User: Fold Ribonuclease pancreatic from Bos taurus.
Amino acid sequence: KETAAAKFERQHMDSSTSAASSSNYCNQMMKSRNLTKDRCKPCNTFVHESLADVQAVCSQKNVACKNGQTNCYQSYSTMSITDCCETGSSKYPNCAYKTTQANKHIIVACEGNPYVPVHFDASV
Assistant:
């Protein structure tokens, strides 16, 4: 099956490009990463940093997870990200998104061996 770590990468990683210099970015990425298959995932964040740099966050600032668990970590620095959220008219199966570029500290849930990101908790 798809591992939790693999899912995090498919849903949230995009090192392949430094940014989303296109209004079509989210529509294309949400679609290609299968985030529009059975429903339009409302909002989703893509991180534009190397997978290695994101994985390194798992040994950075230990902070509470949204659910109160102890395995979340916040990046010391802000990271380049793209926030994708449905437009007002977006209605499954015709998902449509608004692309917003930003730079924020990210918080990820980590697990396993190797200890890696398995959930994108939030960006602050």
Observations:
- The chain has one domain: 1-124.
- The longest strand covers residues 79-86.
- The chain is about 20% helix and 35% strand.
- The first helix runs from residue 4 to 12.
